[PDB]
Amino acid sequence: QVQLQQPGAELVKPGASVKLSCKASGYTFTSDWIHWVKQRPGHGLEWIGEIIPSYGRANYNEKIQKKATLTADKSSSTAFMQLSSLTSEDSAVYYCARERGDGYFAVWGAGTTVTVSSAKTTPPSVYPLAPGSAAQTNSMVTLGCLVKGYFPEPVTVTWNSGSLSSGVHTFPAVLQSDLYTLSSSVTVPSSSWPSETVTCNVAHPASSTKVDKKIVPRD
Amino acid sequence: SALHWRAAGAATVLLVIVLLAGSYLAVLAERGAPGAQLITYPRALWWSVETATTVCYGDLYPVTLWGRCVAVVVMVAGITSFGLVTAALATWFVGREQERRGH
Amino acid sequence: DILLTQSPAILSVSPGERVSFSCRASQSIGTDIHWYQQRTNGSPRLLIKYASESISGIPSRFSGSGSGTDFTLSINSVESEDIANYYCQQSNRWPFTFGSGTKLEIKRADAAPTVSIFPPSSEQLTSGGASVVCFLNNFYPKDINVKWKIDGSERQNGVLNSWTDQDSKDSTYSMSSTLTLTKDEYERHNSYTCEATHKTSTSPIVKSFNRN
Amino acid sequence: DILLTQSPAILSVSPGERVSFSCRASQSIGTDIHWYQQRTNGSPRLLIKYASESISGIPSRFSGSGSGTDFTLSINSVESEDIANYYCQQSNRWPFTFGSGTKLEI
Ligand SMILES: CCCCCCCCCCCCCC(=O)O[C@@H](CO)COC(=O)CCCCCCCC
Ligand SMILES: CCCCCCCCCO
Structure with missing residues (x-):
């Protein structure tokens, strides 16, 4: 423990x-x-x-x-x-x-x-990042989530409740107009999505929030 | 039942207690103090042993008022406990010699 | 108070090499030196205690040596997960003090970036704003440039970039470039293009999408 | 005899800043360093004894630190009345000696 x-x-x-x-x-x-x-x-x-x-x-x-x-x-x-x-x-x-x-x-x-x-505590807006319809994939596909408009640091971003660890990058936040923005990226075998679910989890402790965002193809 | 042996045994257990308490309290007393070296418990027990025996190498020593007062308690307890053991040995020898000459 | 000097402040090695970090104390402190590893966004982790003693669960390639004023932390055959900051700490005299830290860098083979462009999401537009996100992932070396074009014309306002530190999984870098518009301005244009320039190819890597 | 080096000899700071005076002993002297303040035309006044201990009636923005050979007198948020010469003094070994002094300028 x-x-x-x-x-x-x-x-x-x-x-x-x-x-x-x-x-x-x-x-x-x-x-x-x-x-x-x-x-x-x-x-x-x-x-x-x-x-x-x-x-x-x-x-x-x-x-x-x-x-x-x-x-x-x-x-x-x-x-x-x-x-x-x-x-x-x-x-x-x-x-x-x-x-x-x-x-x-x-x-x-x-x-x-x-x-x-x-400044005031602001929880983040979490938006999906799925490829546009003209993008071509190879053996891997890259998805992400945009975490925008939050204050103060930090947030924690996990993928599929932590189960998805390899192929993740979470970028350092940028500050503008007293709000923070970052993105996280995940790469999974292209044959496996959207067949198997891919979800990002964003914890923001200063606002006691934790939100989920499924990444689905633009339909 | 003999007083000297029971006092020796008491002094031994009291000395062990004083070494442990002196280790704890020396660390407690010295960590306030810049430059102090008597600040972790394993070497503080070593220091308390050398203080209690007067076999004092100079590798560790207190620099604060309260660490030095702890030191004095450990010194006196050590010297007194070993002196008590000496005194009990003398009482045993004196009794055995009174017997050997039939008194 | 004991100064602990860790120099050099950054060490660059190739995978499989043996590396040595230096810690020098301003006075003699026996073997009362302890080493910690801190990865990006992580808490410090004890590696070696009392200059050379192993800690349970630490890979055996880690060892320590020295006594007095000069101390060395060594790693046999560096690998990617060893990318971290490394600190020494003395417990010989009050107060405990820390060295200033040595960063470990790994020199791997060149790798072109993987570029992906992402149009704004529906939810974001419903809220009334548009962010276009480009990822330049898993490249080496770190130096790289990103160019945005809208309808074929270079764009500079509203671009915020972010770079990761070297990745403890494969020793690459990555970068995110985020072009943020209003819904209106995003709606008066059609072609959005991310262009990456890296020494691994004279031609930029280009990813585009049409809002149509 | 223990040389006490106070360098730099003049320190220039802005009001409200934190300032630090340095005193280096030519050999190790534990915490047996004492700091005095002397204003223009005034007599010296003890500020800090035994490297870090407070003196009654001295403003709390004054503090001291260090042990061995390196010693620092610090002032939190300098103000005008702090304009003075500042001396360190060792009592570890005979004879007592003084540093050469640091002037504080605002
Ligand atoms: C309540 C406060 C505690 C008070 C007593 C603390 C006792 C500490 C445990 C001592 C053993 C430490 C384990 C260890 O591996 O120690 C080594 C460290 O690597 C070096 O040991 C040492 O160097 C000092 C030990 C000297 C023992 C002297 C014998 C006394 C009859
Ligand atoms: C018997 C000696 C008493 C020990 C005092 C503990 C140290 C307190 C320092 O503030």
Whole structure:
């Protein structure tokens, strides 16, 4: 089972504050430390601080401005990081990780994408991408889905509820007019579609939405 | 039943407890501190053993006030436990020699 | 606080080769170095602990070595799934610190792009907008150019492009080029053309559709 | 005797910015570094002791960090009253020594 569970995303207005969570499962010991690590897009890993839940003591990276406050709840096995008075410098993925007191990060959470913006949460519009009637195929056919008009990042795109993994590309999103757009592409043997269903699944955590879109030929 | 042997055994179990608690608390005390090396539990137990025996290599040591206070507890517990073992050995020898000379 | 220098910042190798990442600590730290792999959009994953010790479930081609200030992560016979960023991390002294990371790149054989053009969907037009999407998939090397033409005339406004990082499945790249119009402007034209230019052929690869 | 190098000798920043002064010791001195501020015609004033510990009455935008040979004094959101010379001082080994100073300009 996934050892550390964190929400996919949080949207925070400048100057506001947000409490991130990290729920632990698996073996727990009195020597466990929970660490938090910040990664800005296209950059490295930056250690924020650590907490020992068994005792509640937290330490912080001295070299950076303290925007975090770490707490832990033993009953719910959950670690929290209160980020305070955020600016755009604080937009990033925040990971939690567990260290068994022997110095290395055995396991990491999936990360919470925090976006600091005044813009409003907008779920995405998902549109199919099927070839026009004049396109010719070979032994493979390429289909896709367009995910347009969403905010903030990220979305997760899967194919046939994750069952379809080979032949997928999901492109990085582009930002325009405070909205994000991306496409995903899938390539399957041409003999197999539309005979066998091909569906894209778009999860947008910041708006708690998950929509399906079957790809059918233009009829 | 003899007091010296039971006190030796008690001191042994107490020392094991102090080594484990000192390892835990030394890590707890030292992780706040830039440059500190006494910050993971396996080597902290090693450090607590060398502190309890006074066999102190210099590879690890506390740099904080509270880590040093933990250190002092481990030192005194170690020195006292081994001194207690010595004292029990002496009591055993003294009794056996009183017997060997028929007193 | 211990600086960990990972240089070079990018390593380029051919499949099957042995590769070595470097991590240098600003002071001596025994073997208290740990290595993590992070793929695109993924979370970090421990590969090697305490400079050389194996982790369960990590392919055996990964190994580590060194002690003191100089550390090496090695991969025997690189393959595509190894495309990732690689970080070292020290636990000798408080606070724990990370190296700045080395990206692994694979140099594979040239491959022409697979181009596909997609007309806007019915739902999108029903909403009142039109996006025309072109895919340039699974090409190598990364450099490539996309040209849009409408009714035979080059178009530039409304085009937004996006490139993937190198693909951990086959070491290729891909790109999406998305021409976004209003329903009206899309309706005053008929021929929509995506044109890809890549060093694998002097002639562009062209995909078109007529709205008719 | 421990040389403390403060470079650059002058730092120029805009109001509201975060600024960082550097102090490098010629050998390792743990966290035995202390920072002082001296304004024009004023006497030195302790800001940070033992590399990172706060002093009562010093504005919270002042912080310190580092250990060993490399030390940083940081100011969050510089303002005008911060215009001053800034010195580091080591107490790890006899004799105590001072850095040569960094001037802050806005
Ligand atoms: C509640 C807080 C915990 C308090 C006690 C923690 C005990 C830690 C387990 C010790 C074994 C670690 C396993 C391992 O493979 O350790 C190696 C790491 O690779 C190196 O071991 C070591 O180098 C230190 C072990 C020295 C033991 C001294 C004997 C004492 C009578
Ligand atoms: C017996 C010694 C008490 C241990 C104190 C724990 C360290 C707390 C540091 O804030």
